[PDB]
């Protein structure tokens, strides 16, 4: 699995303070300056030391500590009033302003949730106020504690090895030794998410691609109001069949016809060998046609992928309900002394494996939509077809568990898991 850790806010504070003190000792700088450097360089100590040896002036400028190199005032530039010399503060940029206006500036910014990003009051000036400068300018303790909380938030966000738990009101931090776009789960609120973008787990797609896909699903006119079909007419009977299970292999109870929920085409074409339902039938010479036909083809392709994305989500939901009913039936058998949980554990294992596999499959479709043509896309489409075929086989067998024995169900489990593993090892990239 992915090697991650769940730390409390106290442990995270301790780790961050250790890093700060080490860097402040090494660089012969104050703690606030060291924090500024660490935040600007995402707490990557190696790059910080390398660039400090390369150009210390450029490092202090980029970290917003010193102004770019390329007699008092007694007049604050924002309140226009004359003030005392001691009540006239400034950063290294020497932009001087009076103490009352500094207090007002910091108080407003902190009240608006700003932590690290408090900057000089002069336009364009990139300098950022260090902690030891802001803290005396905050009068009350709730303001100082708000500032500390926002600073800790910004520190965990900027730290390349740490991420705040997206769970609502969850005071946990997820730590990772080598940050990648992989699945993590907080052990206090059970929130699952991708480590890189802090959104829903989305393998094999990367973070940018899935963000684009979600925005397109929500914004495009043809999909913003989309509702998946609850019922469909049997290709043989025309009877209104309802989709209650997650398995897309439907058998009409009236005529015994086996068809596919996405196609309305017969199921004997949807075996593991020669699985075609998941590939988009692309047009090769449609780049050489009119803009009308090109836009129509773009709509066709987008809908082909989006409908399967949506239907696999719906199937995940329906299969979760099926798993709940299975759990209830095993509970009933156990209390009736018809067996024990160990003898039906294979069924719940199959259900969890099916959920995992169909999650992966659901996310394979944005990946296939945003892929460019070529042999890599053909390889991905073959692996995706194998995954989908074995997934629908496993879901059929899980929905009808009393008609199948332990052996073939575990075999289908292993087959679907192997297909999912192959897809992930080939296409879950950096
Ligand atoms: Zn002023
Ligand atoms: Zn300034
Ligand atoms: Zn959590
Ligand atoms: Zn991500
Ligand atoms: Zn029928
Ligand atoms: Zn199909």
Q: How far apart are CA 365 and CA 368, in angstroms?
A: 5
Q: Å resolution of this model? A: 2.5
Q: Given the structure tokens 């590939």, which residue do they identify?
A: 279
Question: Looking at the CA of 119, which ligand is closest?
Answer: 2
* Residue from 187, 268, 197 nearest 5 by CA: 187
Ligand 2 centre distance from Cα of residue 47 (Å):
27
The domain at 88-180+188-194 falls in which architecture? 2-Layer Sandwich (3.30)
Which residues have a beta carbon within 5 Å of ligand 1, which is an ion?
76, 79, 98, 101
Q: CA angle at residue 415 from 411 to 419, to 5 degrees?
A: 170
The enclosing H or E element of 309 equals helix 291-335
Measured in Å, residue 423 CA sits from the centre of ligand 4 at: 18
Ligand nearest the Cα of residue 266 is: 6
Q: Is 106 annotated as a binding residue?
A: no
> Which residues have C-beta under 5 Å from ligand 2, the single-atom ion?
93, 95, 120, 122, 125, 127
Residue that is written with structure tokens 């209104």 in the block: 240
Beta partners for 176? 4
Q: Is 6 annotated as a binding residue?
A: no
Residue that is written with structure tokens 């003898």 in the block: 343
Q: What 3-state DSSP class applies to 383?
A: helix
- 202 in a labelled binding site: yes
Residues, CB-to-ion distance under 5 Å, ligand 5: 234, 236-237, 252, 254-255, 257
Distance CA 38, CA 46 (A): 11
Q: Where are the domains of the chain?
A: 10-62, 88-180+188-194, 207-427
Task: Based on the residue annotation, tell me whether 247 is a catalytic residue of this protein.
Answer: yes
**Fold observed for domain 207-427:** 1.20.120
CA of 121 to the centre of ligand 2 (A): 6
Give whole-number Cα distances, 215 to 53, 207, 304, 316, in Å.
Answer: 43, 12, 17, 21
How big is the chain by its Cα radius of gyration, in Å?
Answer: 29
Question: Considering every ligand atom, which ligand is closest to the CA of 186?
Answer: 3
| Spatial CB neighbours of 1, under 8 Å, sequence gap ≥ 6 | none
Is residue 395 within 8 Å of 425, Cβ to Cβ?
A: no
Name the 3-class secondary structure at 233: strand
Contact present, 125 and 94 (Cβ < 8 Å): no
Distance 236 CA to ligand 5 centre (A): 5
Q: Give the residue among 296, 292, 309, 295 at the shortest CA–CA distance from 226.
A: 309
Handedness of CA 242, 248, 252, 255 (dihedral sign): positive
Rounded to whole angstroms, the Cα distance separating 175 from 14 reads 13
Q: Which ligand is nearest to the CA of 188?
A: 3
Residue 89 CA to ligand 3 center (angstroms) comes to: 41
Nearest to 245, CA basis, from 168, 182, 322: 322
CA distance 61 to 147: 24
Q: Residue 416 and residue 354: Cα distance in Å, rounded?
A: 8
Going from the C-alpha of 202 to that of each of 117, 172, 177, 223, the distances in angstroms are 31, 22, 20, 20
The Å distance, Cα 192 to ligand 4 centre, comes to 12
What are the angstrom distances between the C-alpha of 269 and each of 213, 217, 258, 264? 30, 30, 10, 11
Assigned token pair, 146: 């708000």
For residue 240, say whether it is annotated as part of any ligand binding site: no
């Amino acid at each position: 699995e992915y090697q991650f850790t769940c730390l409390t806010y106290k442990e995270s504070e301790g780790a961050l303070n250790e890093h700060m003190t080490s860097l402040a000792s090494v660089l012969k700088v104050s703690h606030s300056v060291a924090k500024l450097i660490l935040v600007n360089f995402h707490w990557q100590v190696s790059e910080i030391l390398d660039r400090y040896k390369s150009n210390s002036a450029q490092l202090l400028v980029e970290a917003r500590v010193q102004p770019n190199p390329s007699h008092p005032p007694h007049h604050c530039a924002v309140c226009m009033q004359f003030v005392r010399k001691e009540n006239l503060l400034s950063l290294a940029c020497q932009h001087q302003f009076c103490r009352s206006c500094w207090e007002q500036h910091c108080s407003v910014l902190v009240k608006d949730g700003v932590g690290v990003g408090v900057s000089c009051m002069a336009q364009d000036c990139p300098l950022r106020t260090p902690e030891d400068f802001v803290f005396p300018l905050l009068p009350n303790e709730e303001l100082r504690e708000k500032y500390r909380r926002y600073l800790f938030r910004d520190y965990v966000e900027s730290h390349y090895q740490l991420q705040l738990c997206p769970g609502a009101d969850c005071p946990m931090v997820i730590r990772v030794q080598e940050p990648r776009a992989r699945r993590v789960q907080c052990n206090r609120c059970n929130e699952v998410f991708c480590f890189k973008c802090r959104q829903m787990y989305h393998a094999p797609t990367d973070c940018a691609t899935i963000r684009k896909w979600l925005t397109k699903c929500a914004d495009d006119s043809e999909t913003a109001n989309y509702i998946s079909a609850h019922t469909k007419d049997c290709p043989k009977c025309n009877i209104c069949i309802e989709k209650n299970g997650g398995c897309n292999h439907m058998q009409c109870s009236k005529c015994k016809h086996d068809f596919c929920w996405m196609c309305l085409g017969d199921w004997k074409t949807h075996g593991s060998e020669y699985y075609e339902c998941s590939r988009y039938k692309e047009n090769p010479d449609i780049v050489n046609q009119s803009q009308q036909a090109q836009a129509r083809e773009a709509l066709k392709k987008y809908l082909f992928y989006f409908e399967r994305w949506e239907n696999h989500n719906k199937s995940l939901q329906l299969e979760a309900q099926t798993y709940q009913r299975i759990h209830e039936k095993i509970q009933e058998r156990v209390m009736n002394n018809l067996g024990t949980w160990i003898d039906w554990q294979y069924l719940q294992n199959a259900a969890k494996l099916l959920a995992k596999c169909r999650y992966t499959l659901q996310y394979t479709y944005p990946y296939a939509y945003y892929m460019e043509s070529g042999p890599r896309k053909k390889l991905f489409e073959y692996q995706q077809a194998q995954l989908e075929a074995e997934i629908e086989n496993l879901s059929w067998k899980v929905e009808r568990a009393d008609s199948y024995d332990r052996g073939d169900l575990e075999n289908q489990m292993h087959i679907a898991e192997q297909r999912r593993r192959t897809l992930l090892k080939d296409f879950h990239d950096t």
